[PDB]
Subunit: 233 residues, 7 copies
C-alpha cells in the first residue's frame, strides 16, 4: 500500500500500480482440492495478465486509426502503422509483466498449483514413509490451507510452505532478470524516420482539434449574441 | 482503501471509485435462512447496479435536453440525440459493471446465494452420507455464517467456503474478459459527423452562458454605481 | 473514513460527507429496555435528519432576503421567491436523505427499534416455545446488547441479528431506489425565466459588493495618505 | 480524527476542529468517588467552554480598539462598537457550543456526574433490593470505572451505562436543536449601516498599513543605496 | 498525532506543535523509587520548558543585533531594544506553556512525583490501616508502575491513579485559565511609536539585503561574460 | 513506510526509495534447509542489486547514443563518452548499495546464510555439548524459522538470533562507512571540459526537439485550416 | 512517524528528520553477552553520528572548491575558506547531535551498554545478596533481553530497566541543555566581510552557470535550425 502510493508519487506507465494494488487487494483462495489446485493456480497466473493486455490495448486512444488503416486496401503510412502498433504493444506489456512478477515473488499461486504433484519426501514423517501416492495427493493438496490441513502427524506444513515459496521466489527473480536483459538489448538496438512521421501526425491531430474547437467557439458566439438580445428584453 | 485513493490520484470516470468504496464500506450480512439466502444474494448482486445505472443517468447535466427533444413532435438533430444518448448510456454503464466485478471477485454474494442448493457431497462427512436433503438445506444454509454454523461433525465449513469462492472468482474473471472483449470490439468499430455537431452545440452552450453572465455583470454595474452614490453620502 | 475522504476529493453538496462522518463517529447505544427501545430507535432515525434540514436552511446566506420579501406587503419577484426558496429546499434535503440511507444500510436503529415487538418464533428454542409474550418482551429487548443478552439457552442472538439487519438493508435499498426515481423524474420535468432572473440578481449582488469595497478602498486611501504625513514626521 | 481532517479540508470557523480534536485527545478520567464525581463531571462540562470563550476573545486582533473606545469619554462610532463587539462575541461562541455538543453526545461527563445520585432500581439485583442508599452511593459511584467496579452480583454495569448514555445523547440532541433554532431566528431577524461603516474602517486600516509599509520601503531604499556604495568599495 | 497535523494545517507559532509532538513521542518512565520519584517528576515538568525557552531564544534571527546594542556604550533605539526584546520573549514563551499544559492534562508527571508523599488513607485496605509510613513510602512509590506494583492486597492502584490524575487535570485547567486571563489583560493594555520604528528598521534590512544581492548579481555578470568568451573558444 | 514517504518528500536519486520499499514489501522466507540456506541468503544478497544495476542502466534515456558511438569506427567526443558513461554508471550504483545496506542492517539474509555453518558453542546446552556436527547442521539450520525450531532443550533460538543479527549490523555499518569514505574521496578528487561539452550537447538535443515540435505544429496548422473549411460546410 | 512528517511540513536542515526516522526504523538488538554488550552499546552511540558527519560533508556541493584551494600554494580568499569551511561544518553537525539526543532519550543503548557493570544491589533479591560478581555479570547481561532473562527469582528486570532508562533520559536532557547553551553563545558572539565576499562568489557562480546554459542554448539553436531543413525535406 504505502509502496504503491510512493511509486505513484514518483511517477507524478500508470497501470503498473493498478495491477500491483489489485493483486494486493485480491482474496486469493486456493480451493485445496486435488482436481482443481493446478487449474486455479495456473489460472490466477495466466488469465489476469491476458486481461491486462487487452485492457492496455483498448484504453489506448489510437486503436481506432489502426483498425481504419488495417481495413482499407491502401490508406491515406506504408510502415508507421507497424511502428505505432509496436509502440502501443510495448506500452501494453508492462502490466502483465508486473502482475506475473508480483504473483511469483509472493509464492501463493505456485504453492497452490504445484502442491499436490511435487515430491516432498524429506518433509513427510518417517512413519508414513510408505503409502500410496494417491493418498498423499489428497493430503498435500491441503497444504496451502492453514485451517484445513489436519495431518501434522504426517507432514510439516510450514517447512514445505517455505520450500515451495523459495522456489517461487527464485523463479520470479530469474524472470525479472530475463525481462531486464531483453529490455536492455531492445533499447540498445532500436527505425528512425517513422518516429518523426508519427510526431508529425500527432501534432497534426492536436492542431486540428484546437482549430476546430476555436472555430466552433467563434461561430457559436454570433448566434449567442444574436439570441441574447431578447434575453435582455 | 489505499487502492481506491491511488486510483483517484491516477484519475486526477469517477463513480467507479465511489462504487468500489461503497462496496468495501458495506456490512454484508447473509441472513443464513433457507427461504431467503437466494433472495438476499441475488438482490445484493442485481439491485445496486440498477440503482447505480439510474444515478449515472440523473447526474448527467444534459438529460433535460434529451427529454425536451423526445417530447416535441419535431425539435429545433435528427440523429445526434441518438449519439448523445448513447454516449451518456455508455458513461453510465461503468459503475454497475465495476460493482458486479467487485462483488464477484469477493465471493460473498455467490456464497450466500448458492449455498443451500448446491451439491457438496465430497465435503459432507461420510457418517451422514445418507439423510434427507431437506435437512441438508437448513444445514448448508448456515455455511456463510461463521458464528452460527454448529455442525463441524457433518460438513467442513472452510472447504466448502473456499470451493464456492473459487467458483465465484472464476465467474468474475470470465465476466471481466467478456466485457473487455466487447469494449475492444466497440472501440474497433465505432458515426462521425454527429460527434462534430455535438461539439458545436456544446461550444454554443458554453459561449451562450459566458456571454449571458458577462452581460448580466455589465448591466448590473450601472445600477450598482447609481445606488452606491448615496452609499458614500 | 477512507471513503468519506475519497468522496471529498471527488467533490474538490458538502454536508453529505459531514452527515456520513458524524454517523460513523457516533456512539450508538441501544438502551435495551422494553419501554424505550422503540423510542430510541425511531429517535435516532427521525431527529438527526430534522436537525440537518434546519442546519441546511440556516447555513444558506440568502434566507434573509426570503424573509424580507415574505414580510413586506409587496416587495421590490412575484414568483422567483418560489424558485429560489425551492432551490434552497432541494439543496437542503440532501443531508437528511444521506443520514437515513446510511442508518438504514447499517441495521442498528432498525434492530434497536423492532427487536421487542417483532415475532421471532423460528429462532426461539423449542423448549420455551410456550411462554407469556411479556417475558419474551424483556428477553428480546436485550438482543442488540451483546454484553447483556444472557439467554443463549432460549434465543440465538446472532441469527435474529442477521435477520433484522437484512430486513433493514432491504428497506434501505428500496428507499434509495425510490429517491433515485423521484430525482430522475424531477430532473426530467423541471420554470425557465425565473432562473435567468435569479442569475441577474446574483450578478447584481456581486457587482454591488465589489463596487462598494472598491469605493471604500479608494475613499479611505485619501485619509490614510493625509494622516501618514505626520507618521513620517 | 479522519472526520476532523475532512472538516478542515471542507473549511479550506477554525477553532471548532481545535475543540473537537482536543476533546478526542483528552484523557477523561472519572475519579469514581462519591464526594467528587459530580464536581469532576460538571467541571469537564463547564470549565473548558469558558476557557474557549476567553481564548476566542483574545485571539481576535481588534479587541484592542474595543478597549480603547470603551476607555475614552467620547472617542473618535456611537454604535458600531456594539456591532463589532457583538460580531466578535458571536464568532467566539462557536467553540464552547461545539465542546458541549461533543461532550454530551459521548455520555462520559454525564455518566461520571449523575452516577451516584440517580435512581437505578430496575438494574440493582433483587437480592439487595433493600439496603441503605449510602452504600449504594459508594457502589454506583464506581460505575463509570470498569477496572474498579467489583459488584457484578449487585448491579449490571453495562445496562446502567447504556441507560445514562442514552439520556446524555438525548440531552445533546435537544441542545443541538435549540441552538439551531436560535441561529435560524437570529439570521432571519438581523442594523444595516453599521456593517458598511465597519467595512469602511476595515478598508481604512488595510490601506493605512499598506501605505505605511510601502513608504518605509521607499524611504529605507535611499539609506540602503547610500551605504551600499562603500559595500562595493 | 492526527490533532497535531490538523493544527499544523490550520497554521498553514510553530514550535507549539513541535513541543506537543515531542511530548507524545517521549518514553515517560517513572523510576518508581522513593528517593527519585519526586526528582524525576519535577524534572520532566521543569527542565524541558527551560530548554524550549532557550531554543526559542536562539532560533530568532535578530538576537545578534540585540547583543550588539547591549554591548556598545551608546549604539546607533533608546528603547525599541526593549520592545523587540520583549516581543521576542513573548514569542518564546509559547512552547514552555504548551509543554506544561500538555504534561499536566495527562497526569503522568504529577502521578510520578506526588505518589510517595501524598496521603491515600481511603484507598489503603483496612487490614493494613496501621503500619509505619516508611513502608507505605516504598509501597506507594510503585503505584505509577503497572508491571511492578504487587500489593493489590493493600492498595487499589487504579483508584489512586484516577484520583491523582484528576488532581493533575484540575491543576492544568486552572493553569490554562490563568494564562488566558493574563494574555487577555496584556492584549487589552499594551508603546506605539516603537512598533513603527521597528517596522522601519525591518524594511531597511530587507531592502539592504535585496539591493546587495542584486548588485552582486550585476557586478558578477560582467566577469561571467568576460570569462565565457574563452568558454566558447 | 512513513520513512520512505518522508524521504520522497525531501527529494521533492529516486530509485533509492523504490529499492527500500521493495525490500520492506518482500516476503523474506528462509528455506531452513542445510543444503539451501547459504544459497538463499547469498542470493537475496547478490541478485537483487545486480538486477537493480541493470534496471538503472536501461531506464537512462541516453544509453542508445552510447551504443551508437561504441558501434561506429569513428563517430561524429573522443572522450566525453567515457564521461557520460561513467556518470550514468555512478547514477546507477545507488540502488544496489541501498539494497545491500538495508538488507544488512536487518540481519535476515545473514542469519539465513551463516546459521548452519557458524559455531555456536556457548549457546548449545551443556547436555548436548558432544554430538556430531552433522546433526547440529540440521538443528541450527532451523534457527531462523520460528515455527519450525523445536529444540529449545538444545539451543536458545533467541540468543543466537541476536548474536548473528548484531554481527550483520556491524558489517552493515562498516560497509556504510567504507562507501561514504570512497564517495568523499571521489568528490574530493574529480576532467573539466568534458562536462561543458556534454552540457552543450544536452542543450543541443533540447533545442532540436523543441524546434522540431514547433515546426511540426506550424506546418500541420496549414493542413488543418485547409481541411476545416469543409468542416464548417 | 507522525512527528517526523510534521517536522518536515514545518520545514517546508533536512538531514535531521532523516536521522530521526532512520533511528525509529532501526532494529536495535542488544547481543546480551557480557563480552560484547558494552561494545554494541557504545558502537550504536558513536559510529552512526560519525557516518552522519561524513555524509553531511560529502553531500555539500562546494567541498570540491575547498579541496582545490587547500591544494594550491596560493589560490585565486586568504580567509573566506575558513568561513565557508566552518559554515559547512556547522551545517554538518546537526544530524549527529540529533542522533545522539534521540538515542539517549530512548534509553536503549545506555541500557545495553551499562547493564553488566553497573551496581544494582537494591534490585537483586535478598536471598542471592551474596554471590560472585562474575555470575551477576552473566545474569545482568541478559537484562535488556526480555525473551532471554529467566531469573525473575533474582532480579526484577522491569525495575532495573526503568532505573537505567531514567539515567539515560537525564543524561540526554543535560546534553540537550549544554548544546543549546553553546549554540546561544555562538550566535551571540559571531567575521563580517567574509560573509559578503562569499555572497559575491555565490552570485558569481550562479550568473556564470546561467550565462553558460543560455549561450549553449543560443549557439545550438543555429545548428538545430540548419539540420532541421532536411528534416522537413
Ligand atoms: C511421526 O509419527 C509418529 C507416530 O506415527 C509420531 O510419534 C512422531 O512424532 C512423528 N514425527 C514427525 C516428525 O512428524
Ligand atoms: C464423521 O462423523 C464421526 C462421528 O459421526 C466423527 O467421529 C468423524 O470425526 C467425522 N469425520 C469428519 C471428517 O467430519
Ligand atoms: C433448548 O433448551 C434445551 C434445554 O432447555 C437445551 O438442552 C438445548 O440445547 C436448547 N436448544 C437450543 C437450540 O437453544
Ligand atoms: C442476585 O444475587 C444472587 C445472590 O445474592 C445471585 O445468585 C443472582 O445471580 C443475582 N442476580 C443478578 C441479576 O445479579
Ligand atoms: C484487605 O485484606 C484482607 C486480608 O488481609 C483481604 O481478604 C481483603 O480482600 C482486603 N481488602 C481490600 C479491599 O483490599
Ligand atoms: C539442558 O538439558 C537438560 C536435559 O537434557 C535440561 O534439563 C536443561 O534445562 C537444559 N538447559 C538448557 C540451558 O537448555
Ligand atoms: C527471593 O528468593 C526467594 C527464594 O530464593 C523467593 O521465595 C522470593 O520470592 C524472592 N524475592 C524476590 C523479591 O525476588
Amino acid at each position: 500500500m504505502v509502496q504503491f502510493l510512493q511509486a505513484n508519487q514518483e511517477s507524478f506507465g500508470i497501470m503498473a500500480l493498478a495491477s500491483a494494488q489489485m493483486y494486493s487487494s485480491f482474496e486469493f483462495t486456493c480451493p485445496c482440492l486435488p482436481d482443481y489446485n493446478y487449474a486455479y493456480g495456473i489460472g490466477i497466473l495466466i488469465v489476469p495478465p491476458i486481461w491486462f493486455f487487452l485492457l492496455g490495448y483498448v484504453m489506448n486512444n489510437n486503436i481506432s486509426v489502426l483498425t481504419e488503416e488495417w481495413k482499407r486496401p491502401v490508406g491515406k503510412d506504408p510502415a508507421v502503422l507497424r511502428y505505432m502498433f509496436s509502440s502501443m504493444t510495448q506500452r501494453a506489456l508492462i502490466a502483465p509483466a508486473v502482475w506475473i512478477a508480483v504473483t511469483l515473488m509472493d509464492g501463493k499461486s505456485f504453492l497452490c498449483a504445484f502442491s499436490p504433484t511435487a515430491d516432498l519426501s524429506e518433509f513427510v514423517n518417517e512413519s508414513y514413509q510408505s503409502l500410496s501416492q494417491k493418498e498423499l495427493l489428497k493430503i498435500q493438496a491441503k497444504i496451502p490451507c492453514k485451517d484445513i490441513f489436519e495431518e501434522h502427524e504426517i507432514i510439516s506444513r510450514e517447512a514445505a510452505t517455505r520450500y515451495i515459496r523459495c522456489l517461487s521466489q527464485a523463479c520470479g527473480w530469474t524472470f525479472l532478470m530475463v525481462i531486464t536483459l531483453v529490455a536492455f538489448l531492445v533499447r540498445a538496438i532500436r527505425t528512425q524516420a517513422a518516429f518523426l512521421k508519427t510526431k508529425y501526425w500527432s501534432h497534426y491531430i492536436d492542431t486540428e482539434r484546437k482549430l476546430f474547437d476555436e472555430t466552433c467557439k467563434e461561430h457559436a458566439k454570433s448566434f449567442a449574441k444574436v439570441c441574447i438580445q431578447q434575453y435582455f428584453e
